[PDB]
């Protein structure tokens, strides 16, 4: 849940 689309 580190930001990545």
């Amino acid at each position, epitope marked *: *849940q*580190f*930001r*990545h*689309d």
Partner: antibody
Amino acid sequence: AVTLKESGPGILKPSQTLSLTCSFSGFSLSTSGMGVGWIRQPSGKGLEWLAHIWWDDDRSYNPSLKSQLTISKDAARNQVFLRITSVDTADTATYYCVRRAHTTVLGDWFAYWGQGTLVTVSA
Amino acid sequence: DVLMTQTPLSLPVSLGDQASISCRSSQSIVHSNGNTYLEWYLQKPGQSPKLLIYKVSNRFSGVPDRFSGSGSGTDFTLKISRVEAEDLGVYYCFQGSHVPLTFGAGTKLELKR
């Protein structure tokens, strides 16, 4: 042409507040999906991620240092800042500014790193 | 935290040798979006780290094809097909999937004598 330039105080004493600045060009932090962060390396040791900040004001921190860290930005001036309160000799390191986007097109990787700013902490 | 274990931490080679570095994660590096954000970095003495490989096996622009990355899950490898002098330095694996983002301790590619 992407550039990343870090600046800091060079030397600081334990308990003091480290303020670092990354000034960049050739991309905008207001661009959808863009982010900029900081990684550090205590001289002769390995690499430690500190914080990242996104185009939309969302932020991510290393939990070990959560109480000591603040990442912020001035997107209009092309600047990202990191603040570290209550520093100690353990925070002696080269601090790097890195670019990292959360979208595949903009670059989801640490491709661009500054040259790094050396910070020594001692009384 | 996701511990990234590199094997070996020091690797003696002669120029021309094939070279392999293992990186193992303590949990899965697969993001909920389905990508595996495993990256390999090279730091040559006195320089900042350089991206070599992202997402397990993608070579970054300008990186020589003698470098390749493979693996899946918790088990990853960097291979150099023929080590050149410019390749010597410290290799880190890195996972960008879980907070905190974490690097391996570093594997020093050094010369055999």
